Ligand SMILES: [Zn+2]
Ligand SMILES: [Zn+2]
């Protein structure tokens with residue numbers, strides 16, 4: 205469900221923010237999570253992060269905009285809390 | 291082939307045990323290997339490891355239980371040896 | 377487009393050579409890039425790197441041969457520069 209998606213993305217971002225995983229690990233993990241649920245635009249945003257064209261804050265902003273366009277309410281709160289933590 | 295799958299999974303786990311790769315790298319690599327061979331339940335178990343809901347030992351235990359119902363004998367030996375190393 | 381593919385592969389190899397990512401991260405990233413563009417032989421070569429049967433130089437060599445067979449010209453230049461940087 206979309207609750208487990210939000211929980212997993214929030215957990216991955218939490219491990220990134222505590223220093224347990226680095227930027228490439230975060231990119232790979234979050235892109236895999238997004239691909240496993242069928243959301244490809246978010247996967248493209250994480251692909252842009254993985255390449256290096258954007259940073260974590262930019263990726264979070266574009267992910268929040270895409271979630272707004274997709275109506276993923278549980279993921280919007282996770283992304284906003286992550287944005288304010290950075 | 292199933293022997294090559296067992297060889298690659300064993301090599302990845304041996305890399306993790308020595309200290310060459312960490313938990314996230316091992317999760318991503320083993321999930322990729324399992325997805326490349328069409329074993330989806332094993333992929334879900336490695337996904338739970340990547341999320342953070344289980345550890346390496348628990349993942350090995352559930353992987354062995356799932357490989358028992360699949361008839362992957364070489365993978366069973368690989369997982370048993372990896373379990374006893376831990 | 378094949379220009380974006382070559383750009384991303386060159387960028388990933390450049391991060392590897394600068395030392396900001398390691399061998400497993402490079403393998404995962406380059407395999408993901410190759411799979412996202414529908415090139416499977418390149419993906420198999422990167423998979424062989426991921427397991428540990430070949431190193432980065434050998435992978436770059438076989439990737440160059442595969443790109444010669446596929447007629448991808450920008451990838452050839454990227455791989456040649458990466459080979460000579462090693
Ligand atoms: Zn991708
Ligand atoms: Zn998965």
Ligand SMILES: [Zn+2]
Pocket residue numbers: 322326407419420423
């Ligand atoms: Zn693969």
